[PDB]
Amino acid sequence: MSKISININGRELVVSAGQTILQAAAEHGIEIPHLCHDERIQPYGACGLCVVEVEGSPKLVRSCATSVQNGQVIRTDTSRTVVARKTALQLLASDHRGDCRPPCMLACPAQTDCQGYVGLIANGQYEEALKLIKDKMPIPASIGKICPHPCETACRRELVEEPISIAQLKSFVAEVDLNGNQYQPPMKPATGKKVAVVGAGPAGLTAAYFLARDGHKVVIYEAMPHPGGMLRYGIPQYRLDKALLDAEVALMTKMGIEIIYNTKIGDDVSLDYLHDNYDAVFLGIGSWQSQGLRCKGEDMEGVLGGIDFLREVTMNSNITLGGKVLVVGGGNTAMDVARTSKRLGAEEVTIIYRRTIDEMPAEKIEIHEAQEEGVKFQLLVAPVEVLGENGHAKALKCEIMRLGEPDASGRRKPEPTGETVVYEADRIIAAIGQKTVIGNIKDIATDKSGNIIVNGGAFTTNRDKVFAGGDAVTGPKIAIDAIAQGKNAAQVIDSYLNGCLVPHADSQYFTQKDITAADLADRAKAPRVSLTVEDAEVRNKSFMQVAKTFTEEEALRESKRCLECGCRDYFECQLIKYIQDYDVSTEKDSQVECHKTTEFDNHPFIERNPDKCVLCGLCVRVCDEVVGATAIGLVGRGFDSVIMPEFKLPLSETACISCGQCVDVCPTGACMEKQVSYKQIPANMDSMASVCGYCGVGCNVNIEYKGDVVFRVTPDRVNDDGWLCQRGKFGLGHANDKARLTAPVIKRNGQFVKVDWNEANLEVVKRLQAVVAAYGKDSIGVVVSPRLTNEELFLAGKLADAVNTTIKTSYSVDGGSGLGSVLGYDASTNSFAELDNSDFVLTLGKVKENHPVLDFKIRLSGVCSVAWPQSLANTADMKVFLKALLNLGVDENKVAEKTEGFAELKASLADVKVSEEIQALAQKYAKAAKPLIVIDEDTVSAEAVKLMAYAAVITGKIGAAYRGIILVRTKNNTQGAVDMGFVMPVSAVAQGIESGKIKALVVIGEDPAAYPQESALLQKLSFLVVYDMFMTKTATAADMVVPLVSSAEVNGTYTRSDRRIQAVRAAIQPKTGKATLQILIETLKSLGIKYDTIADVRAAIASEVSNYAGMDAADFGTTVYWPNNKNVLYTDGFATEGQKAILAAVGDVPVFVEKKKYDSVEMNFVNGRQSL
Amino acid sequence: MSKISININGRELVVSAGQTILQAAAEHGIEIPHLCHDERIQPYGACGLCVVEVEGSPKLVRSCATSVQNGQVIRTDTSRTVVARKTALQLLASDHRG
């Protein structure tokens, strides 16, 4: 039928009927904007960004709410749709208030993400901080050491106290990585293009770095014996250590960049040579000519430039200074020359300038350091005449000025006074400024000041294939400007090499400019970290460093003080994405009203900001139509429309479940989830696909992390439905806990002593062997938790077998659900995927409260779901239900053939009367063609499960598709623990403890000792081992504790409630050193069973466990079910001894007794809920 | 369509409406014999090796010439289909020379 073939945007597509055009274009990779669209709920039609032009319809049709037909023509980028989307986005931006990026990053010329790496330092991830920094420059330590930090001026912490020392943190992290493992960023595969870079300054080095990172081959031609440019030959040693720069350039050279020294372009190698032999040329020559005194007698011997003097100082040449030195100028050159001459044996140095101290262009810190060192300032003075004798200059004549009106740049103009003064000197150094010289390079256009003329935004000179940047274009400026220009020019050159030149253009962000000190009166005040500066005694005579780098403690203390000004949703916000894509300006107005809120919702998990809302309605639609709590709703009309909780109450006082679906469907930053880490940040986080470790539903999750810290959890919308509950969303926060154990401890004299892993292994094996020797067989019980993977449970069973015991148990499993004795397998007879096609679902227990994602799925399915009444708590009512089902005409012959003991059961129910409600429920179950039963194991006794199985068996609604019993378990791998044999009841363990038969216990991940009776039972032991993550109540009373890792650091598999085996992948490396599987493998190697890796364990599981045959090549990335990869159990008969269902009479039953929680993680979550 | 989804041979499959059960089983890697079937032309119904057992229908249905519906249970290796295919292949082999 050429499956519904359509034509969109000129292309021909094959799609499926009943879809939406938006879904089809997403399937075939065509981008159509949308904000209020979600495929799992009904269309809303609010934004209007998804309008497309369909031939035959005079008006625009929304692609989110129209069905694909055969042979329709669609256009998504016509002028009408473009202007409609532009208008909608302009109207949306007229009410949106926020900071897309913090002021500190926007003030930096290179746009380095200061908030991101400051926050990453505050979380203790230094390598990730350097990975953030090195996306914008290749030399972070030097730049952090010398930058005048314009970013630090714009920091909003200035509104409270001194701002964050951003540059010192950058230098600290760069030095910590240089002393440790040097980072090399990944490179694209080689493209074969050749780029020649003239000059190895910051601009040239940055261009070469960012061009070699794109696969090209870069060669640097340098006119000096060492690389660095004015960072080497202009910055003195006591401010920037040259060894640091040499090490950084060596790191860059290790990437494959060839630097050719002693080669001057124009004098030694012509530029035509580079033009002919290379695919691109980038000129980063910089400004290297000293301005003269611009006065009479400036050519006299004894007057030298500041730049040449500094270069001669750097090359360790022979210089002459004499006693008295006069430096003319006020920039950074004058300061550096003055202090260098002070360190070079000059007894007195004088600085001469024309404006006030307050109008010096140098930094105030450098001026104060120079004043402390001993250089005297001579003020309000300009050059007049240089007086000398016999070709030697000894005096400088000058005029005295006076203060005048401020200029347009904010500095007071000097005015002459007519007073002359002469100054004695032995050397005069002119440090007025630098000027660009082009040298012998020809056919390059230059401006009136000597700078290279380039096309703005494209960095192209008059000559083709030749580019320029840095001080050659902007004149003398700070180093970060040169780095930014080099990076932008590298991007432009890379685009040019691909055949299409695109100019560099800035981006649009939302910014807020009304923040004042009165808005930050609730913040605490913390003093800034002072810098340790060497005393003025040693500074005046030596060239060593005057300041020391931050220590780790100081860096943490400084970094934990940021305010997090930026938006946390920036890297996933769609409003800003469409604003950048559709060229919409974010500048505000004054008359238009953006309503500013004074909201206060201190919910511990959910954050709502009404200012960033776009009224897409996804959050309220999800919370009503899926979750069903309806904790939020719309209030008002028009501009007063706002989404807010029930009766304007706080979200904590309403029916909210903190599931986080409203957070996960929001397209902007209005709804946000709270922070799992120590200090959360806006960042591009790595994602790992795993499954939830709390319930038997086993929802797939994506763990978003940065380094060794997990930051958030999101649903997996591709492989599952994409729903989560509070435990899945906010439950991985124990992986970052600082109270986790790190090394095993052995008790001696009543105190725990830290031991090595080998000593721990020896101690546990020898003590277990001693217990076995002293008390014989069956003296050891193995108590495990159902949270462990399949391989760890199999290895624990192997350890139980090899230690000569049969007591393997769990407090959570506590003997299983009782369905095993009737049908043969203690497992669900149907999968979750069959809840969609059933026509009746009967729920037993609190399925909604305990496993809520299953309730979401049942509600979205729309099938008729009837809950078992609460006023029927005893099983006499279930016996009445059985009698009512029997009276409705069941086939007795088939149930006589396929079951054992049907006649006795029928005789037992002979005198049972039937009530009306029971009759109605029985009728509803009887007329249903394909009825399912969903039983919550947390709130239903085993005998009720047996009676429900009897009801399903006698009606013949079991053993086939879309009919049976679905049983949801308490924990993630309760089914796996059942399938490995951990099905012994706990009462046997208690009795064996109190009868003296059991002398030792091995507890893996459980906390039985939190209750007084079990603690009293454990106190009568002889040797107890606890494997746990935390020093719980049980581990305190043990004789030996071994740490465990969390579910974010383990590789393995989990068996779902419906017998589905899902792979669990490790996001971060084990913080204790060894995984649980490794610990069990070494213990079994000590006991004499040899396993190497997880493949051997999986092969052993396949070859020893009966129903997991095929796990060796199972490919757990797809759907794997353990009974012969079948969704339905008992298709060819039950799995009992005689292939018949075993029906046995059950007695009178009291009200259900609520079960307890024994897994340490699941009680830690409950206790940590109360902390906020 | 929400999800046209079927259950064949115990497994749960997601399919597309308007197809044949033979095409769906080939899509999901389930082997059903066929000799006179081609997806690009009309069904013929000659060999009979494509018969499957569908719940609700008392007689065998040919998977090459039936449309896939929602929530149907299909068995392709029951004893009746096995003996039918064995008989058909025994009758075919009674005239084949080579």
Ligand SMILES: Cc1cc2nc3c(=O)[nH]c(=O)nc-3n(C[C@H](O)[C@H](O)[C@H](O)COP(=O)(O)OP(=O)(O)OC[C@H]3O[C@@H](n4cnc5c(N)ncnc54)[C@H](O)[C@@H]3O)c2cc1C
């Ligand atoms: C006294 C002084 C104080 C300073 N203080 C600061 C400060 O506080 N903060 C700060 O951030 N920066 C400071 N700087 C540095 C300066 O502000 C910038 O770092 C400057 O922009 C360096 O970048 P650039 O691109 O110009 O590189 P350059 O340093 O100009 O690099 C040019 C390179 O190309 C080479 N070259 C030149 N001509 C040719 C040719 N024809 N062929 C081949 N190679 C050639 C040069 O030898 C050099 O290696 C200071 C500099 C000086 C001199």
Ligand code: SF4
């Ligand atoms: S380079 Fe300068 S402006 Fe940029 S982050 Fe570092 S200190 Fe701030």
Ligand code: SF4
């Ligand atoms: S407080 Fe932090 S986020 Fe805000 S401007 Fe300062 S460094 Fe940037």
Ligand code: SF4
């Ligand atoms: S929600 Fe989006 S548009 Fe609004 S401030 Fe955050 S990043 Fe910017």
Ligand code: SF4
């Ligand atoms: S967290 Fe869940 S229940 Fe609470 S408001 Fe959001 S969607 Fe509704």
Ligand code: SF4
């Ligand atoms: S809070 Fe978020 S999801 Fe809800 S209407 Fe506003 S933008 Fe949409």
Ligand code: SF4
């Ligand atoms: S329902 Fe259970 S398995 Fe699913 S996310 Fe919640 S706690 Fe995890």
Ligand code: FES
């Ligand atoms: S109107 Fe369709 S995406 Fe909003």
Ligand code: FES
């Ligand atoms: S394949 Fe021949 S009858 Fe269907």
